[PDB]
């Protein structure tokens, strides 16, 4: 019998989290301050003025259909009445930050994969490797480095939601018809004027689909990270399934469902 790995892994992780603590403490500070800043100040404001804004925005993107606005109003207001508005402001900053980081990390990586073909041959199977595996195993590399808290949930989310963004970015870049690229290269476009002026404005519609997948994946992953300590509605759910208080768990789950439907309909209608 041999069981050598665990020791090697814990040793390497201690070495990292000891020799790089200069970075991890900074990341922890930044994460906690961003969270408690854009969840209490940029949000957590009158819960009858935000649901109204969202209702009229749904009206805009819907035109005449009143189902989705009725849901937004008889939704978010339902949450508030149930007293879960402060746990929805969180669970939004989390998906917000996770989506922003996944974007910042994928879109560039998507460009790099579109230019070089060997980079794609490398990463695309890696992306299927990361989108096939269960996401619950993205928590180890989170609590191992950042321990429990918010930033580990964010890390798990960005590394769980990244693949689709990268894939659809690569697509939307290396699916724009080569003739336009010839045109933009004939007038001397140095891959930075070309990108913004031609490729993004044409890929947008493909990329944003990857991003509207990224957002849902980040929501799923933060709800799962609730196990770690990532605040929001997930914790509620968690508590319930730990104490079998189906009322609290169900209301939190229905709040998450409402948030999910809203985000889906928005992120879809704002893509076409």
């Amino acid at each position: 019998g041999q069981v050598p790995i665990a020791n090697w892994v814990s040793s390497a992780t201690d070495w990292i989290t000891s020799t790089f603590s200069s970075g991890f403490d900074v990341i922890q500070k930044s994460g906690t301050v961003l969270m408690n800043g854009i969840t209490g100040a940029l949000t957590a404001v009158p819960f009858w003025l935000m649901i109204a804004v969202v209702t009229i925005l749904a009206i805009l993107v819907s035109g005449k259909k009143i189902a989705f606005p009725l849901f937004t109003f008889i939704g978010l207001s339902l949450i508030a009445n149930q007293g879960l508005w402060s746990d929805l402001m969180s669970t939004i900053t989390l998906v917000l930050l996770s989506s922003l980081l996944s974007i910042i990390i994928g879109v560039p990586l998507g460009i790099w994969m579109a230019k070089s073909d060997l980079v794609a041959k490398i990463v695309q199977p890696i992306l299927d490797f990361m989108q096939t595996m269960p996401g619950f195993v993205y928590l180890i590399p989170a609590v191992a480095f950042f321990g429990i808290g918010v930033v580990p949930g964010v890390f798990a989310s960005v590394i769980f939601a990244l693949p689709p963004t990268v894939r659809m970015t690569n697509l939307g870049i290396r699916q724009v018809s080569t003739e336009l690229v010839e045109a933009a290269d004939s007038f001397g476009s140095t891959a930075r004027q070309k990108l913004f002026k031609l490729e993004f404005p044409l890929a947008k519609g493909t990329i944003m689909a990857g991003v509207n997948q990224t957002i849902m994946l980040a929501l799923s992953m933060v709800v799962i990270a609730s196990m770690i300590g990532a605040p929001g509605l997930g914790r509620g759910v968690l508590a319930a399934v730990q104490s079998a208080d189906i009322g609290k768990g169900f209301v939190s789950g229905i709040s998450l469902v409402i948030l999910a439907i809203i985000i889906d309909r928005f992120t879809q209608k704002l893509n076409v």
Binding site: E179, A183, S186, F187, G188, S189, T190, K197
Partner: protein
């Protein structure tokens, strides 16, 4: 003179140096076209283009016809050869030098019009300047004057999807001109048009060329248009140039009997 060529060639596939020494010798082409697949695009072309003329180029598929243009621009990296223009060899230029070359001297026109559908015409036509970081007002007036020269300034706010093949080609040519280059490249410019508008654009092109003098190199399939417009025609096949006959090609025909 304006252009001079020096043993221009382009070979695809790996086995780069071996295939290069194979093609430079004059070995059979179909042999390698069917044997290894390291296709051949060009055959050690050594010609030239004089200033203020129209060096049409003809051939069928697999003739490496359009490839020569994209090699002159370096849109596809040439295996070996040299293109001396304005006392400049393009194949041996750094990034910025080739950039300024493409931005001032040369500029292309495309078969399928190569137009940015997501941009307005007066937004497209100015691309040749936008890339140069030109004063918005200056480039705007230049684009408007270019549309005027083509009489399409009224449509300076529509989108290409709402226009006709003829107007699309005209806007592409306006985009080419707004840079006021010394060279004008075309690649099957009028393959998606019908005879009437084809000949009309041909006549307008010769009118501008005589009024506004500048070098042109043209790509086409039919000899009728070449003689209507071409001042020095060039036949090609299997990536090899045959001749440079203006009114002699109709006479000297080593299998150039396509005149009828």
């Amino acid at each position: 003179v304006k252009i001079k060529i020096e043993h221009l060639t382009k070979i695809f596939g790996k086995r780069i140096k071996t295939a290069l020494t194979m093609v430079e010798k004059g070995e059979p082409k179909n042999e390698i076209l069917k044997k290894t697949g390291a296709t051949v695009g060009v055959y050690d072309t050594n010609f030239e283009i004089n200033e203020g003329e129209i060096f049409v180029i003809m051939g069928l598929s697999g003739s490496g016809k359009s490839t020569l243009l994209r090699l002159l621009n370096r849109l596809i990296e040439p295996t070996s050869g040299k293109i001396f223009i304005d006392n400049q060899d393009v194949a041996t230029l750094n990034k910025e030098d080739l950039l300024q070359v493409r931005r001032k001297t040369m500029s292309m026109v495309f078969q399928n019009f190569g137009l940015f559908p997501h941009r307005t015409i007066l937004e497209n036509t100015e691309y040749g300047l936008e890339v140069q970081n030109v004063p918005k007002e200056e480039r705007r007036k230049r684009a408007e004057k270019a549309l005027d020269n083509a009489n399409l300034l009224d449509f300076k706010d529509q989108y290409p999807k709402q226009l006709s093949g003829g107007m699309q080609q005209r806007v592409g040519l306006a985009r080419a001109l707004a840079n006021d280059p010394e060279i004008l490249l075309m690649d099957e410019a009028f393959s998606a048009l019908d005879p009437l508008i084809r000949r009309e654009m041909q006549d307008e092109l010769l009118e501008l060329q005589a009024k506004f003098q500048k070098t042109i190199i043209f790509v086409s399939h039919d000899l009728n248009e070449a003689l209507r417009i071409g001042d020095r025609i060039a036949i090609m096949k299997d990536g090899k140039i045959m001749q440079i006959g203006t009114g002699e090609e109709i006479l000297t025909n080593p299998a150039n009997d396509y005149v009828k």
